Amino acid sequence: XTXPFXX
Amino acid sequence: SGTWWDEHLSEENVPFIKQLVSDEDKAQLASKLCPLKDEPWPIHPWEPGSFRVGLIALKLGMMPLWTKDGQKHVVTLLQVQDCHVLKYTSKENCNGKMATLSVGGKTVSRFRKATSILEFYRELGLPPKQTVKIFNITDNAAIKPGTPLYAAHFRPGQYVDVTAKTIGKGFQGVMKRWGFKGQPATHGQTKTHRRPGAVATGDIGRVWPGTKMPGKMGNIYRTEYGLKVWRINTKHNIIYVNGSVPGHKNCLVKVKDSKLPAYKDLGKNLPFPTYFPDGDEEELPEDLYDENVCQPGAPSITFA
Amino acid sequence: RFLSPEFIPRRGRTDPLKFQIERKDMLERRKVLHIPEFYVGSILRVTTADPYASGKISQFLGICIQRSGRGLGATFILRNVIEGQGVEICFELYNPRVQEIQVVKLEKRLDDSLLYLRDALPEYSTFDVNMKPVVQEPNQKVPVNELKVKMKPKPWSKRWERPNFNIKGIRFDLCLTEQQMKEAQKWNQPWLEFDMMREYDTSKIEAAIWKEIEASKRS
Amino acid sequence: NTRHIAFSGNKWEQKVYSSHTGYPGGFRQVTAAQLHLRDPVAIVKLAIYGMLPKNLHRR
Amino acid sequence: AIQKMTRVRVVDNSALGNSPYHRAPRCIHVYKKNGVGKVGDQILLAIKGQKKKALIVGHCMPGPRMTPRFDSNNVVLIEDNGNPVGTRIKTPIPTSLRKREGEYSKVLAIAQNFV
Amino acid sequence: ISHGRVFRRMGLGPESRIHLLRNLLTGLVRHERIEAPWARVDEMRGYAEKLIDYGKLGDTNERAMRMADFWLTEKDLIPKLFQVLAPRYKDQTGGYTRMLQIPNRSLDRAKMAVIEYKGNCLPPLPLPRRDSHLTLLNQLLQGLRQDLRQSQ
Amino acid sequence: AAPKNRRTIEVNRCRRRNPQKLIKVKNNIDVCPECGHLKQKHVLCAYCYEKVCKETAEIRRQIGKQEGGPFKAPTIETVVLYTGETPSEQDQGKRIIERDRKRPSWFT
RNA sequence: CUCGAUGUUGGAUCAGGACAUCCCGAUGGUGCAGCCGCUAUUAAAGGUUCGUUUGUUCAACGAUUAAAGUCCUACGUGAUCUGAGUUCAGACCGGAGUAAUCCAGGUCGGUUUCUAUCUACUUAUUCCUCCCUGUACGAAAGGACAAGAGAAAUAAGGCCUACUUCACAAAGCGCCUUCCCCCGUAAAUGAUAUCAUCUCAACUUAGAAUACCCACACCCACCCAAGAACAGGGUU
């Protein structure tokens, strides 16, 4: 859920 | 079990052994100083295309040198302590392009060696030596074993090549080894400052042999070519060589006439064998220079 | 007696034969060139044979900041401010293109190295070329001028206030604050001078050097 | 007398023996003429090494 | 030594040179394969919103041993083909500039002091 | 990488290492014997030799007094030093301390060594005594030695 | 990082049994003539060192209880004395300490 | 094929390769007098700048250079790095829509994990200065190419006597050394085809080696300019 992995 | 000599003898006997072996090896050197009284091999004059056996020396350090024009040249001092020949080989016996000789270097303890080489040095007549390096040579320059190689084997105005082992840095990084730019410091570089970064591509799926990456650097036989002689001093058996040379101080180095196309044919004015001080009508000076070197004790230069 | 700071070798290890050879060479040169005794903080005038100049000779007077190097490559630094601009030279005292040395004045400063004269006021290094030699008696002690020096504001190059330099000519009581000196004494490392394995005893080798100098001189 | 061997045609010029040392740029081809001049045995050696089967008994 | 983006002080007496301006002279190019600039090397210098060629008299790095070092850098203006702008330079300059007098004859002529 | 470095890294800094070996020397000077890890005593041996060399100067030398004050923390052993140990080695110039390797520590299995000022009071150590002159090889050696002496 | 295949017992066995991982058998032991126990060449006999240390520690206890507290280190040499011995003219001026035992075969 | 996860743009480091050559090399033609240029053949050994705003690749601009080449490598490379764009959760503006909310519209901000199990791997060029030379060439103007000498930059390999960062030593900003060519064409004689014709007719011409390493159970322990350990050198 945060761009990412896993921002 | 395996042991050493110092243990199975007494303190009153150790100095006896020391002085005895020192006297013995020094007497061997004094006996082999003069080869002409022995049986020398046939001597031949210089010819075009021929070669000369080099020698090996001991680096002391560096020094400055000034020319007549006042410009500077840094210079290494190479010393030759004993540097005796060890053996001779024939072209068809060694199966090589060219005949070969062997030259020894630094005299060391006869105790820290192997039985085979000890027997070899005994039957040869000389003490042991640190390094025994090989010199390619034509047959006309055949030199007998047990012959000392003095510093007069070379002269000023001469070009030369020198081989030796480099400084040992151990396992070093890709940067100091190969000279990569590295990665910046700030701007968010996370644990990547001196890394090599990429290694190869993605489709290649492997790393090419001969790729640059961290490893042991130094401690290898590297050679420098085209150096030049500025001064020879005979009583100390030291020679000057321009610029610099590989290796640490007090290292053994190999020296040979320069092989370059421009510096190959000049071998007529020089002794085709080594320099034999005995038997000559005259004895050379202590030191001798190139004509374009300001000699100490001479007046300061003054142009016009 | 007095020995030069370049006959003595460096702490590093090597064969004393190298030192002996370079020593006898520089002494064969000393037989010609006089190198009048001097120290740091002495004012020296030097004449050198330069290939390009009016008469191909170059004169230069300056205060000695330091004597560096060993052997034939030994040098001394000179400094002088002329026309409001500060020049410095590094002279090799065994080069043959130098014609002769002269000591206009012989002094010793509290600081063994005087590189802080860069940041010091120009008037301290302002020495005229036309000043004649201050004749000194042939056998007397060395005059030590116990003085202190004013300096440019803080924007320096070397950060002289630290204690590793162990220098005293500067006047930081005026040049900075009690707080800044207390902050600078942070780096105080007494174990440097209290340690006893790092220093280099010289008596042996300097005695040998005296011996060899006397021998080569009388020979 | 592997030195005194003869091909059929212009093989000395057209045929190429190629090998990669392993390093980048180490791909090198040599005509049979060059390969004969440098080693008169290698031609027949390679021919036999090819005719032979590819098992461990080949060596 | 002298390279890109170095505050230099013009030494000769020139209106363009010693005219006060809210930005100091700054070297933005050196006419060598590398970015460093040693004595006797042409460079390019920005003054008062324009740019002109110049020749650096002395740098504050230690070069050769007895070659002089200057506590501050120095440079003199010059036209494209060696016509100096300033009339004279009362400050000292290195003697190593008259080695190339074949090109800087007028720059050496307009000088007074030498070191 | 290091080439020619004579010192070795011991604690959490130069101050820390000189303090450590200072405590070692202060404990060694009074008992004139001490066991400790090999490297520490190895480097401290030179410190002790230099320390007694500067104690030879006597109690008058302000330099040596300040040095001993720094190096010794108990402040009761420097007079002992000047008045006992310098007179003890007034004749000798070197070989002030004997250093001998011993078995490892019990639990840590670290190599240890005992260091001891020569000419102590407490009992001696079981030093390694060289083989007797009466042995076969020593007797043959003495035989040809006396033979050479007779010849010359 | 993470493995991808369970390493086989035979390869693990080759790894952990190669001579590099094995222990060195050392031919560097001999008997001490005094005690009769075995010792490394360059190392001292542990038995002899232990007995010497015990004696040193007991005489240290004695000199400590004699001095009676810290900061009492004298500025003179000191000498031990065992039962059945008299101080010598040489060590009269030197401090003396008494001990309840007899002179062994090795200590002077 | 891969959605029980194949991690993007540009940039940094490292670069491997193709040649459809930007430079340097050798040739043919020219509407090539010469310096300048255009085109075509061969040549991939070597190299192919620094900055201003922009996330930028590109582009514009400034100064240069012999040159500032095109492309492939998972739009090479994020278990090596950055996250400035794009951009989840917040918010402002313009517009759409009643509203929720939306806009390849903008704008500020917004956590980039891994201890390596296996494969693989880990020691010579170029510019410039001088004679050629104001020469040939060229009405003049302009203006060389060859050969030679010198001084430099780059890349590689080494060194501490200067100097510097420094101090028993390590390093550069400092010092020393660096040697071979490349094939496309232009020429002789001469037959098929009796002249001629450079020859896929026989033939004649312009056409890599060298150097480096090299022996061996003394070897507990100690020292080392040798080294993570093992190893290597010394202990006279």
Ligand SMILES: CCN(CC)CCS(=O)(=O)[C@@H]1CCN2C(=O)c3coc(n3)CC(=O)C[C@H](O)/C=C(C)/C=C/CNC(=O)/C=C/[C@@H](C)[C@@H](C(C)C)OC(=O)[C@@H]12
């Ligand atoms: C402008 C887009 N940006 C900023 C918003 C996103 C950067 S991105 O491209 O890496 C992101 C993840 C993969 N996406 C693809 O479009 C894509 C193309 O091919 C593939 N994916 C296949 C793979 O990449 C295989 C791999 O196994 C897939 C991974 C590791 C995906 C992990 C989960 N990521 C998401 O669910 C992302 C959802 C949003 C953010 C979308 C939209 C914004 C376009 O971004 C992507 O999926 C994006």
Ligand SMILES: [Mg+2]
């Ligand atoms: Mg960096």
Ligand SMILES: [Mg+2]
């Ligand atoms: Mg992080």
Ligand SMILES: [Mg+2]
């Ligand atoms: Mg970091």
Ligand SMILES: [Mg+2]
């Ligand atoms: Mg500075």
Ligand SMILES: [Mg+2]
């Ligand atoms: Mg403007």
Ligand SMILES: [Mg+2]
């Ligand atoms: Mg620790």
Ligand SMILES: [Mg+2]
């Ligand atoms: Mg899966």
Ligand SMILES: [Mg+2]
């Ligand atoms: Mg996965």
Ligand SMILES: [Mg+2]
């Ligand atoms: Mg092509």
Ligand SMILES: [Mg+2]
């Ligand atoms: Mg071309």
Ligand SMILES: [Mg+2]
């Ligand atoms: Mg990609």
Ligand SMILES: [Mg+2]
């Ligand atoms: Mg990309």
Ligand SMILES: [Mg+2]
């Ligand atoms: Mg990857």
Ligand SMILES: [Mg+2]
């Ligand atoms: Mg990326």
Ligand SMILES: [Mg+2]
């Ligand atoms: Mg970002």
